[PDB]
Structures are given as C-alpha cells and as structure tokens.
Amino acid sequence: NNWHPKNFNAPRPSYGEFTMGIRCRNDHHSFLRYVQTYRNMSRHCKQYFLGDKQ
Amino acid sequence: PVYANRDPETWRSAQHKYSKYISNFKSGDGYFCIPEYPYAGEVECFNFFVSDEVWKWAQHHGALSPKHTFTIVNANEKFVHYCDSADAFIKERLEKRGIRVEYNTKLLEVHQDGQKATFINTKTGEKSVRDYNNLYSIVPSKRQEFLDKAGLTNGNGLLNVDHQTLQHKKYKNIFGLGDAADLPTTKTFWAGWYQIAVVRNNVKRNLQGQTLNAHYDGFSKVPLFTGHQTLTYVAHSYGGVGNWQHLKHNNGGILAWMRYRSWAKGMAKKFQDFYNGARLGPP
Amino acid sequence: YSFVKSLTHNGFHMLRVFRHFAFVLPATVLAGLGLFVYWGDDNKCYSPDRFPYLKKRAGDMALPLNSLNQ
Amino acid sequence: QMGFSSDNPYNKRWEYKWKHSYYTYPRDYEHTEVRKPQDSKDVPPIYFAYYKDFVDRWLPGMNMWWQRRHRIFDKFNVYFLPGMSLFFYQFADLALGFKIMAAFPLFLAYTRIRDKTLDPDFKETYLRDMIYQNPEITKYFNEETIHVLDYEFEYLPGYLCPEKFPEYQNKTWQFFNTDTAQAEGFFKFGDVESGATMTLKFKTMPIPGKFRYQVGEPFYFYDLRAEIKCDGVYKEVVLVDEKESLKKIRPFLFLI
Amino acid sequence: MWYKYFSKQSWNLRVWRKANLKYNQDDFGMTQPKYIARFGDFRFRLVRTEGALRGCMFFVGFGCFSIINYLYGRYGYIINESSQKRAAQDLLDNDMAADKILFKNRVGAPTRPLRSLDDM
Ligand SMILES: CCCCCCCCCCCCCCCCCC(=O)OC[C@H](COP(=O)([O-])OCC(O)COP(=O)([O-])OC[C@@H](COC(=O)CCCCCCCCCCCCCCCCC)OC(=O)CCCCCCCCCCCCCCCCC)OC(=O)CCCCCCCCCCCCCCCCC
Ligand SMILES: CCCCCCCCCCCCCCCCCC(=O)OC[C@H](COP(=O)([O-])OCC(O)COP(=O)([O-])OC[C@@H](COC(=O)CCCCCCCCCCCCCCCCC)OC(=O)CCCCCCCCCCCCCCCCC)OC(=O)CCCCCCCCCCCCCCCCC
Ligand SMILES: CCCCCCCCCCCCCCCCCC(=O)OC[C@H](COP(=O)([O-])OCC(O)COP(=O)([O-])OC[C@@H](COC(=O)CCCCCCCCCCCCCCCCC)OC(=O)CCCCCCCCCCCCCCCCC)OC(=O)CCCCCCCCCCCCCCCCC
Ligand SMILES: CCCCCCCCCCCCCCCCCC(=O)OC[C@H](COP(=O)([O-])OCC[N+](C)(C)C)OC(=O)CCCCCCCCCCCCCCCCC
Ligand SMILES: CCCCCCCCCCCCCCCCCC(=O)OC[C@H](COP(=O)([O-])OCC[N+](C)(C)C)OC(=O)CCCCCCCCCCCCCCCCC
Ligand SMILES: NC(=O)c1ccc[n+]([C@@H]2O[C@H](COP(=O)([O-])OP(=O)(O)OC[C@H]3O[C@@H](n4cnc5c(N)ncnc54)[C@H](O)[C@@H]3O)[C@@H](O)[C@H]2O)c1
Ligand SMILES: Nc1ncnc2c1ncn2[C@@H]1O[C@H](COP(=O)(O)OP(=O)(O)OP(=O)(O)O)[C@@H](O)[C@H]1O
Ligand SMILES: [Mg+2]
C-alpha cells in the first residue's frame, strides 16, 4: 500500500447541519487542469524542435 | 409553515419547528386562526401580540418583506367570551397595533401542495381559497358523543353542573370541573386550582352525607402576553368583574417586565411539584 | 514557496503553519556572500581601536588589557 | 464579466479558480500556436518573477476592485467606518485600545470590499443538475457532448424597480448597500453530437433559507430560460418562471 | 465533460464566505434562543453568524478593556477620591488606637497580640 499510508490523523467525514465553517483547498478543477497542462507542455516544447516532424 | 397550538406526539427531542413560527416569516400571507368556541387555550395561546413586536423589528432591517399580510381569522364574534373587560382591551390593542381581524370565519381545509387555505364565513356560509405562507391555528375541540348519550351535557356539549358547587343538575353523585364544565368563566388552569378545592370538598361531603359548603366564585387567571417580554394578567370573577390585577401594567414597563420573567423562567419548574404534590394551589 | 502568496489562501497554500520560516534559508544563503568579506575580527570593525591591534604592533607580544587607555 | 483577467488567452472563466502549484509564473503566457525559438526571449530579464506577480496577481486584482467599485460606495463604508477610525486615531497615543478601535473599522471595510468585488459565483453543479433533469433539454444536450461558447454573469447596479422589488426601498438597508446583490447573465451552449445550440438566460438573487439570520442561497435562479435552436426547430424552455417564483420567495437584503 | 467526473458527495456543505450555509443555527449556538430582544436581533441580522460576531468582539473587547483601564487611570478620582481619603484617616485612626491598647515589650514589638479580644 503506497496510496494511503496509515497515519493517526485519518480523514473523517463532515456533516452539513453541524459544520459552521471550513478551510479546504480541494476543488473539482483537476480534470481541466490536466487537459490544459498537456496542451501547454506539448506546445511549449515544440517551440524548440525546429519543425523536426520525427 | 403550518404551525399549531400543540406539538404532535411523533416529534423527537430534536424537533423545534414550534419555535420557527415567528422567526421564519420572511414574507407571504400570515393567518392566525381561532376555532369555534368552546376551544381550549383561549387567552393562554394568544401569541399575536408577541409576534407583532418581533415582526415590527423584521420590517425595520428588511428581514420581513414590506409586502406581507397578517390577519387574525376568528370564527367567533369575540376573543374573550365571559370577560368583556379583557375582550374590549384586546380589540382596542389590536387596532392600535394595526392588526386586521376577520370575524365569523373559520379555517376549514389546508392544502399542503400549493399552500392553499380554505376559509368559510360562517355568517354568510361563503367559503374562499387563500394563499398562505405562515399559518397558525388553535387546535379545535370536539364534543364527546358518550357524554351526550348519557344525558350529561347541554347544548354546546359541556357538562351541565351547578355554577356554585360544581355538582351536576341531576345525578348528584356526579361532578365536573376544568374545561368540560359549562361555567361562565375563562377555561384556564388557575381556574382549575379553585375548582379542585371545591370538588374535593363537595365529594368529601357526599361520602359522609353532609351538606355542600364549598362555592366556586368563578375566579380565573391567565397571563396575556402584550409584548415580547411583557405581559398583563387577565383575572376576573363569575360576573366578568376583574380584581386588582385585571389588565394592570398593560402598556409595558418594568412592572410588566418583571411579571413576565416570573412566568416565563419560573413557572414551568412549578408544574413538577403540582403533579408530584409538593406544592398546592395558590392559597 | 512564497510566504506572501500563501497569505490569501488562494494559491497552492491554504494551511501553512510554518510559512514564517520560508525566507530563513534564502536570507541565510544571501548572507553567505559576505562570508569571506567579513572574516575575522579586523574585517568587522576598525581594528586600530581594538586591543589585538596593539599586540601585533608590539611584535605579537602580550600587553596589559588596559593598554589602549594609558 | 470576469474581473480577474491576465494576458493569458486560455480559460478566462477559470483564471480566478485555478490554483497552480507554480513556484513562479511561466516565462511566457500560454501559447496559442507553436512558435519559433527566437519568438520568446531566452533568460527573461532580472526581477522577472517580481514583475510577473504584479501584472498577473496584483494588477488584475486591482482591476477587479475597480470594475466593481460601485458596489462599495455606501454611506457605511464611505463615511461611518472612516469617520469612526478618525475619532479613535486622535487618541492613538493615549493607550493601545485606541489604536485597535481605529484600525478595526478599516479591516472591516476591507473585508466588505474584498467580498463584494469578487466575481459572482453560483453553484454551477446545481445548475447543470437542473438542466439535465429536463427532458426537453436532454433531447439535444448531454454533459459528454456539450461545450461552452460564451459565459456572462455580473451583478446588477443600483436598486431595481420599486414595484417588482419593494424590499430595497429600505433606508436602513440602503445605508449599508448601494446595489441589490442580484446578478444576471446567460450561457451560450452547443452540442457537438446533435448540432443544437441554446442560450440559457438566468436571473439570480439571494434568498433566506430554513434559518433566521443566515442567507440560504446567495444565487437562487428565480428566472431560468432556455432558447434552444436546432436544425429547423426553435424551442423555448422555461425551467423557472419569475412570475411564479417571486410569489413564493423574496430577496434576502444583505447587511454588512 | 468535467461535470461527469464531479463528485456529488461534496454537496454535503454549501460553502460561501468560509461558512457552511446548511448550519442549524436555530438549534445550536447563540442564535438558538428565540427570546432575544431588538438589540440582539439586529446584531445577529448584521453578521448573520455567531462565529463572525465573536471574532470581532475578541478585538473590540481588548480595546474597550484597555480604554476603560485608561479612563480609570486618568480620571477615577471623580468617584473614588472620597473612599481613599476615608481609608487614609481610617488607616491612621486605628493605628493610633493600637498604640493606646497594646502590650509593647522593652523593644517596640507587640509580642502579646492574643492577650485579649480587643488586642487581637
Ligand atoms: C525610486 C526607485 C524607482 C522606484 C520605482 C521602481 C521600483 C518598483 C518596484 C520594483 C520591485 C520591488 C520589489 C517588491 C515589489 C514586488 C511586488 C510583488 O508582487 O512581489 C511579490 C513577490 C513574489 O513572490 P516570489 O517571487 O515567489 O518570492 C519572493 C521572494 O523570493 C521571497 O518571498 P517570501 O514571501 O518568501 O519572503 C518573505 C519575507 C519577505 O521579506 C521581507 O519583506 C522582510 C520583512 C521584514 C519586516 C517585517 C515587518 C513586520 C511588521 C512590522 C510592523 C511595523 C513596521 C515598522 C518599520 C520601522 C522600521 C525601523 O518576509 C518574511 O520573512 C515574513 C516573516 C518575518 C519573520 C517574523 C517577523 C514578524 C514577527 C516578529 C514581530 C516582532 C514584534 C512583535 C510586537 C510588535 C509590537 C506590537 O514577493 C515579494 O514580496 C518580493 C520581495 C522580494 C524582495 C525584493 C527586494 C528587491 C530589492 C529592492 C530593495 C529593497 C526594497 C524592499 C526593502 C523593504 C524593507 C526591508
Ligand atoms: C510627492 C509625490 C508623492 C505624493 C504622495 C501623496 C499624494 C497622494 C494623493 C492621494 C489622493 C489621490 C488618490 C485618490 C484619487 C481619487 C479621485 C477620484 O476622483 O476618485 C473618484 C472615484 C469615483 O469613480 P466613479 O465611479 O467614476 O464616480 C462616479 C460617481 O461620481 C460616483 O458617485 P457616488 O455617489 O457613488 O460617490 C462615490 C464616491 C463618494 O465620494 C465621496 O463622497 C467623498 C467621501 C470622502 C470621505 C473622506 C472622509 C471620511 C470621513 C468623513 C466622516 C465625516 C462624518 C463624521 C465626522 C466625525 C469626525 C471624527 O466614493 C469615493 O470615491 C470615496 C472612496 C473612499 C474615500 C474615503 C477614504 C477615507 C480615507 C481616510 C483617511 C484619509 C487620509 C488622507 C491623507 C491625509 C493624511 C496624510 O472613486 C475612486 O476612484 C476610489 C479610489 C480608491 C479610494 C481612494 C481613497 C483612499 C484609499 C486608500 C486607503 C488608505 C487611506 C489613507 C489611510 C492613511 C492612514 C492609515
Ligand atoms: C458604571 C461605571 C461606569 C464607568 C465607566 C465605564 C465606561 C462607560 C463608557 C462606555 C460604555 C460601555 C460600552 C460597552 C459596549 C462595548 C461594545 C460591546 O461590548 O457590545 C455592546 C454590548 C452588548 O452587550 P450584550 O452582552 O450583547 O447584551 C446582552 C444580550 O446580548 C442582550 O440580549 P437582548 O437584546 O435580547 O435583551 C436585553 C434585555 C432587554 O433590554 C432592553 O430591551 C432595554 C432597552 C431599552 C432601550 C431604551 C432606549 C431609550 C433611549 C434613551 C432615552 C430616551 C430619551 C430620554 C429623554 C430624556 C430627556 C432628558 O433583556 C434582558 O432581559 C436583560 C437581562 C437582565 C438585566 C441585566 C442587567 C444587569 C444590570 C446589573 C447592574 C444593576 C445596577 C442597577 C442600578 C440602577 C441605577 C444606576 O453592550 C454592553 O456591553 C453594555 C455594557 C455592559 C458592561 C457589563 C460590565 C459591567 C456590569 C454592569 C455594572 C454592574 C454595577 C457596577 C457598579 C455597582 C456600584 C454602583
Ligand atoms: C500608521 C500605521 C497604521 C496604518 C493603518 C493600519 C493598516 C494596518 C497596519 C499595517 C499592517 C502592515 C503589515 C501587515 C501586512 C498585511 C499582512 C497580511 O496578512 O495581509 C494579508 C491579507 C489577506 O487577506 P484575505 O482576506 O484576502 O485572505 C486571508 C484569509 N484568511 C484570513 C483566512 C487567511 O491582505 C491584507 O492586506 C489585509 C490587511 C488590509 C489592511 C487595510 C487597511 C485599510 C483598508 C482599506 C481602506 C478602507 C478605507 C475606506 C474605503 C471606503 C470605500 C472605498
Ligand atoms: C495611504 C497611502 C497608501 C498606503 C500604502 C498602501 C500600500 C498597498 C500595497 C502594499 C500592501 C500590499 C499587500 C501585499 C499582500 C497581498 C498581495 C496582493 O495584493 O495580492 C493581490 C490579490 C491577488 O489575489 P490572490 O492573492 O487571492 O490570488 C489570486 C488567485 N489566483 C492565484 C488563483 C489567481 O488581489 C487582492 O488581494 C485584491 C486587490 C488588493 C490590492 C492591493 C493593494 C493595492 C493598493 C493600490 C495603491 C495604488 C496607489 C499607490 C501606488 C501609486 C503609484 C506610486
Ligand atoms: N391550549 C390547549 O389546547 C389546552 C388543552 C388542554 C388543557 N389546557 C389547559 O389546561 C387547563 C385544564 O385542562 P383540562 O384538564 O380541563 O383538559 P385536559 O385535556 O388537559 O384533561 C383531560 C384528561 O381526561 C382524559 N380524557 C379525555 N377524554 C377521555 C375519555 N373518553 N375517557 C377517559 N379520559 C378522557 C384525557 O386523557 C386527559 O387526561 C385548561 O383550563 C387549560 O388552561 C390547554
Ligand atoms: N463539501 C465541501 N467540503 C469541504 N470543502 C468544500 C466543500 N465545498 C467547497 N469547499 C471549499 O469551498 C470553496 C467554494 O466552493 P464552491 O461550491 O463555491 O466552488 P465552485 O467551483 O464554484 O462549485 P460550482 O462549479 O458548482 O459552482 C471550494 O473551492 C472548497 O475549497
Ligand atoms: Mg461556482
């Protein structure tokens, strides 16, 4: 198991009715950032390929 | 947003919907429905004076929309039947506050789907359909049929007993007290404090064949919440005449505020002794 | 990672309890540029006003500690 | 209109949302095509990272405040808070408590300005869940084949018509608010599978929900309309009609 | 198709301005009591939450406490200068009363304070 090593502060759920505020950085922007990062890394590298098709 | 005078028995300890009648009134049409007399909780369940003061605050900072309607739908002609002194004060104060009242109209049907409320004017027999957003109704009573099959009630369906000794007209071995008794007074709880002393006495006298020397004067005391934190006492005798407490400190103030805290914070803890037996009635 | 950029909680850093240590290593490395410029006592002050300068001018000879006063 | 906008050409409606793990900014903005090695400048000049943070983080943040500067010009932010700060600043040397009481209304003013100048962000996942439940829309649109052609969402300036919304004719509310906190916009959609397009117009407003003081939903779609266009069929779908919605719920009237 | 990969299990909260909107403030917190008066109602109306209100009173409290500590330093003798002059002469009246009735040994030390009840 190298995806979820066991530590003490384990993830625990949250309940709407009982939660006042929260500070979290997770969002649902990773998919589109994955697509744009490919387009950037692909295009910015081809700048120095001098048109070498192979 | 339909609220009532008592809680259903299916609610758990975590359900506090009863307290959201005044809080959650952001907008819409509000109706306070009073059923046909006789009904339980005449003055002790009149909360249209405490909601008016709180809803006045909500109109000041925008919590309550400026286009909202609140009217009191009263099926009866008067608010306090057996005390015209207090009934005149209520209608006088409702006009000063600005609340609109519609008499001879009773709530008939509540449509939970589209929030429609079917009212009917018992005077003309004309029914109508009204949109509501905050509905409060005192639970209507119903005469029990077995008390009519045995020939004990009269007319409206209340016990036909003596106004003085609380003994029934016929069947002298049968008594009656509380709300089921037909007494020209307000059916309150403090009225029952002076009705149990008469019943426990007269019953004691019939078990020994002696005479009945216990008379019920018709005293009844109920607080009338005139503000969010102020009240006045509605106390009256059989002839509707009030005592030194009747309708005193009615316009608010320190005297009305102190009497409110004594009933709000220090009365519920006294009903534990009433049922156990530690504390008796007022006298 | 910048301490300033983590203050708004809008780039890459929401909770950083040791963000106030971010510039200690860079400031320490930049101070290493004067490692050889300021080496020893003579390069950090005006040496003729210090006691060791007197011992050197006396032929690396020990002097009483109050020699700068008499 | 998106308030946070840099010279970056791609993903304009996500620029404020995306939190990159970059140590500093990329040398160039995202290329729109393959370029030549001489198009870009090798070894960008000295103090380039500081310049990029000013023109890609600082400057567009100030343009956001300037674009929506009309939402912060209320008598509370303009006169009361600075007037309170000046009253205690005259006694700043008497004790420490005067310095705090003179700086708190400034920090309170910044927080109101910071929150009011942000882009209006509705819960878009609630919206897409709502349009994909309609059978007339799912006939021509699907999440796997839909694409965004244009997006616009901005607050409405000033107080609205004082007949459709009498709530905003409140002198106590006008002391803190110069706008109505309502927003309006549209969505130009297209389906690559069916070839259909639609303009999803919507109006939002804050509503109270289930509680006494807290707002229930800051962006509640009280009017939601779809003008679907197809090969030869033009349909008009009404998800939320304002004549039926405004009779049930009223705005919230934020204070502070 | 980003919404296809969106996880609806994050709908448990409605976060807006760092506050969960689905918070039962009518049953928990300072906003639970419905018997609040006009001042407390208008105060919760402005902030909409107890967490924001308590955070601001944290700093305003330090200012108010530090200000009243100064006003009682600069001023104060307007109300407390009488009780200090009263205790000043009282501190001298009982001192002189002690020297009259107290046992002093050959050096000036009251070595018998428990001689009688009036001496103690
Ligand atoms: C006229 C000439 C032409 C003019 C026009 C042209 C010029 C225009 C501008 C040109 C460029 C200017 C560069 C700056 C603007 C750039 C804009 C921008 O967006 O940049 C973002 C830029 C982007 O981030 P990045 O590229 O990823 O990384 C940036 C850095 O690599 C590193 O980033 P970092 O974030 O990691 O760095 C963090 C570091 C940054 O370094 C600093 O800024 C030093 C800060 C030290 C001062 C802290 C003060 C604390 C509060 C004090 C309050 C009172 C002050 C009174 C002062 C009186 C003075 C006697 O600060 C800290 O370390 C904070 C922690 C400090 C330790 C704890 C101290 C506080 C607790 C102790 C309290 C004790 C008292 C308690 C009780 C109090 C009583 C109640 O970040 C920057 O901030 C860049 C600044 C880097 C330095 C540039 C220097 C260039 C050389 C110019 C000469 C020096 C000028 C500055 C001198 C300042 C005075 C020392
Ligand atoms: C040698 C080279 C170096 C030299 C360096 C020194 C030189 C520096 C120069 C600085 C001056 C120029 C900069 C400003 C130019 C703006 C000109 C302009 O036309 O703008 C109009 C423009 C309107 O644009 P628009 O939309 O096209 O207008 C359309 C309609 O007209 C809109 O119609 P409307 O009806 O909606 O009206 C909207 C308008 C309404 O405008 C107004 O009605 C004017 C109200 C101003 C109130 C100021 C007094 C507040 C207190 C009064 C309370 C009185 C009652 C109580 C009395 C109690 C007494 C204790 O709103 C405003 O513009 C006011 C915004 C805020 C201004 C108040 C800031 C208060 C700062 C307090 C500290 C002052 C320190 C001064 C320095 C002296 C000591 C060193 O507004 C702006 O652009 C706002 C710009 C950003 C605000 C700047 C204010 C300063 C912010 C900096 C924060 C730090 C302040 C200082 C703190 C220092 C100590 C900690
Ligand atoms: C005295 C020395 C002074 C030295 C200098 C001090 C510095 C003075 C300058 C600064 C002034 C203080 C600034 C404080 C504000 C700071 C900011 C802040 O914290 O937020 C506001 C903050 C909010 O308080 P809160 O905790 O949120 O309120 C509680 C609930 O939240 C509120 O819940 P609610 O709103 O839902 O309901 C509230 C209330 C309902 O309240 C109301 O509705 C009444 C409102 C009526 C408004 C009427 C407006 C009238 C307009 C003016 C008049 C009209 C014009 C007249 C024209 C006349 C023409 C000439 O309902 C109740 O049931 C009340 C509970 C029971 C009463 C408790 C009273 C305790 C008193 C204990 C002392 C008794 C002494 C009696 C002696 C009498 C003779 C002196 O306000 C205050 O902090 C007030 C100051 C309290 C300080 C407490 C520490 C001292 C303890 C009291 C003194 C004890 C005696 C000491 C001396 C003993 C020997 C003599
Ligand atoms: C003479 C000295 C006193 C000057 C006046 C008082 C100024 C404050 C004292 C100086 C502090 C400087 C050192 C610290 C720098 C800030 C460090 C920091 O953490 O900031 C990050 C913050 C980030 O805040 P944030 O809200 O964006 O993100 C933080 C979120 N949490 C808290 C969860 C992490 O940015 C700031 O700069 C806040 C400080 C702003 C102070 C501004 C005061 C004036 C407000 C504007 C003027 C309003 C006038 C009226 C306007 C009328 C309408 C137009
Ligand atoms: C009274 C005289 C003036 C007083 C001195 C005022 C000094 C103000 C500048 C120093 C303090 C700046 C705070 C640094 C910490 C925050 C960094 C930051 O701003 O991030 C931007 C942030 C960026 O947002 P972000 O940090 O949350 O991240 C963006 C999100 N991502 C990464 C996903 C894109 O934006 C803002 O906070 C809003 C704008 C704040 C404006 C900052 C102050 C501008 C003041 C303009 C004054 C112009 C006149 C003076 C100069 C005139 C020419 C000489
Ligand atoms: N606001 C209200 O709705 C309400 C209701 C009840 C009591 N109260 C207050 O309490 C005061 C006195 O209340 P109360 O005792 O007169 O009425 P009550 O309803 O509280 O008491 C009736 C009791 O008799 C029982 N009962 C009813 N029908 C019965 C039947 N066929 N067979 C056997 N038992 C039957 C009930 O279970 C109940 O224990 C009232 O004056 C009033 O102030 C108010
Ligand atoms: N269920 C949640 N649990 C923990 N943190 C959350 C949760 N929801 C949001 N957050 C945090 O609060 C921020 C704001 O949430 P928000 O729903 O407004 O984002 P969003 O991108 O606008 O969603 P949408 O696309 O549906 O409009 C989020 O970036 C996240 O950091
Ligand atoms: Mg959003």
User: Chain E residues within 8 A (CB-CB) of chain A?
Assistant: 2, 5-7, 10, 12-15, 18-20, 22-24, 28, 49, 51
Relative to beta strand B116-121, strand B126-131 is antiparallel
Would the CB atoms of E48 and D123 count as touching at under 8 Å?
Answer: no
| A32 contacts on D by Cβ (under 8 Å) | 11, 14
Reported structure resolution in angstroms: 2.5
Are the Cβ atoms of B24 and D210 closer than 8 angstroms?
yes
In chain B, % helix, strand, coil (3-state, to 5) comes to 25, 25, 50
Which residues on neighbouring strands pair with residue D191, listed in sequence order?
A: D146
In this structure, the strands spanning D183-191 and D215-229 are: unpaired
Distance in Å, CA D106 to ligand 2 centroid: 13
Burial B8-43 (b: 16+ CB within 10 A, else e): eeeeeeeeeeeebbbbbbbbbbbbbbbbebbbbbbb
CB B84 within 8 A of CB B242: no
Other C-beta atoms lying within 10 Å of the C-beta of residue E7: 8
D52-74 CB burial, b ≥16 within 10 A, e <16: bbeebbeebbeebbebbeebbeb
Angle between helices E38-47 and B48-60 (to 10 degrees): 40
Q: Which amino acids bring their CB within 6 angstroms of ligand 3?
A: E 36-37, 39-40, 64, 68
The tokens 């919206």 sit on which residue?
Answer: D127
What's the CA angle centered on D173, arms D167 and D178, to 5 degrees?
100
d(CA E9, CA E12) in angstroms, rounded, equals: 6
* Alpha carbon of D107 to ligand 4 centroid (Å): 6
Nearest of E105, E106, E103 to residue E114 by alpha carbon: E103
D66 alpha carbon to ligand 2 midpoint, in Å? 14
Distance linking the first and last C-alpha atoms of chain D:
24
Asked if B66 is an interface residue toward chain D (Cβ–Cβ < 8 A), one would say yes
Do B118 and B274 form a contact (C-beta atoms < 8 A)? no
DSSP notation for D4-54: ---S--S-GGGTTT-----SS--SSPPPSS---TTTS-SSPPTTHHHHHHI
Chain C residues inside the 8 Å CB shell of A24: 14
| Count of beta carbons in the 10 Å neighbourhood of residue B72 | 21
From residue A29, how far is each of C50, C66, D13, D145, D166 by CA, in Å?
A: 65, 73, 12, 19, 40
Ligand 6 center from residue B45 Cα (angstroms): 15
Query: At B110, which helix (H) or strand (E)?
Result: strand B105-111
- From CA D195, how far away is CA D190, in angstroms rounded? 7
Cβ of D34: how many Cβ atoms within 10 Å? 14
How many CA atoms lie within 13 Å of D3's alpha carbon, on the beta-carbon side? 22
State how far residue A23 is from chain E, nearest Cα, in angstroms.
7
Ligand 2 centroid – CA E16 distance (Å)? 30
Q: Whose structure tokens read 């962000």?
A: D121
DSSP string, D46-78: TTHHHHHHIIIIIHHHHHHHHHTGGGS--HIII
D19 touches C: beta carbon within 8 Å = yes
Whether residues C1 and D23 touch (CB distance < 8 A) is answered with yes
Q: If you measure from the C-alpha of residue D123 to the centroid of ligand 7, how many angstroms do you get, rounded to a whole number?
A: 8
Cα–Cα distance, D164 to B66 (Å, whole number): 12
Say what angle helices E50-74 and D96-116 make with each other, to 10 degrees.
Answer: 160
| Cβ distance of B57 and E27 shorter than 8 Å | no
Nearest-Cα distance to chain E for B89, in Å, is 25
Report yes or no: D256 at the E interface, CB cutoff 8 Å: yes
CA distance D16 to D18: 6
Q: CA-CA-CA-CA torsion for D19, D24, D26, D30, nearest 10 degrees?
A: 20
Taking only residues 122 to 151 of chain D, the set having a beta carbon closer than 8 angstroms to any beta carbon of chain A reads 125
SS percent in chain C: helix, strand, coil, step 5:
45, 0, 55
Q: Which residues of C touch A25 (CB under 8 A)?
A: 9, 13-15
Cα–Cα distance measured from residue E20 to residue C18, given in angstroms and rounded to the nearest whole number: 27
Sign of the dihedral defined by the CA atoms of residues E107, E112, E118, E120, in that order: positive
B138 C-beta neighbours (distance < 10 Å), count? 21
Q: Is the dihedral of CA D27, C1, C15, E17 positive or negative?
A: negative
Tokens 């929030």 sit on residue: B115
Binding residues of B for NAD(+): 5, 44-45, 144, 179, 187-188
Contacting residues for E101 by C-beta, under 8 A, at least 6 apart: E118, E119
Q: Give the C-alpha separation, B255 to B229, whole Å.
A: 11
Of B230, B233, B232, give the one whose Cα is nearest residue B253: B230
Q: Cβ E1–D144 below 8 Å, yes or no?
A: yes
The Cα–Cα gap between B166 and B172 comes to 10
Buried b (16+ CB within 10 A) or exposed e, D75-114: ebbeeebeebbeebbeeeebbebbbbbbbbbeebbeebbe
Give the CA distances from residue D209 to residues D49, D120, E94, in Å, rounded to whole numbers and listed in that order. 46, 19, 70
The reply to whether ligand 5 has any atom less than 6 angstroms from the CB of C4 is: yes
Nearest CA in chain E to D211: E26
Mutate which of D50, D58, D62 to test ligand 1's pocket (most atoms within 8 Å of Cβ)? Answer: D50
DSSP symbol at D172: H
**Two tokens at C56?**
């050197």
Which residues from chain D sit within 8 angstroms of residue A21, using beta carbons?
none
- Nearest Cα of chain A lies from the Cα of C25 at a distance, in angstroms, of 27
- In this structure, are residues D194 and D230 in contact, taking their beta carbons and an 8 Å threshold? yes
> Six-digit token pair at D63?
């343009």
Closest among D117, D107, D120 to D72, alpha carbons compared? D117
Q: Is D136 annotated as a binding residue?
A: no
Q: Which residues of E touch D101 (CB under 8 A)?
A: 60, 63-64, 67
Radius of gyration of the CA atoms of chain A, in A? 21
- Decide if B185 contacts B236 (C-beta within 8 A): yes
Could you tell me if D7 and D29 are in contact, meaning their C-beta atoms sit under 8 angstroms apart? yes
CA angle (D226 as vertex; D224, D232 as ends), nearest 5:
170
**D9 CB burial (10 A radius; 0-12, 13-18, 19+):** exposed
Rounded distance between C-alpha atoms, residue D223 and residue D239, angstroms: 8
- Atom of ligand 5 at shortest range from CA of C10: 27
Task: Look at D143 and E4 and tell me if their CB atoms are within 8 Å.
Answer: yes
Query: For the residues of C23-55, what is the DSSP string, one character each?
Result: THHHHHHHHGGGTTTS-SSGGGS-GGGSHHHHH
Q: Which one of the ligands is nearest to A15 CA?
A: 7
Q: Does the beta-carbon distance from D173 to B62 stay under 8 Å? A: yes
Residues counted in chain B = 283
E interface residues, D as partner, C-beta within 8 Å? 1, 3-4, 6, 8, 11, 14, 16-17, 19, 21, 23-26, 31, 44-49, 56, 59-60, 62-67, 69-70
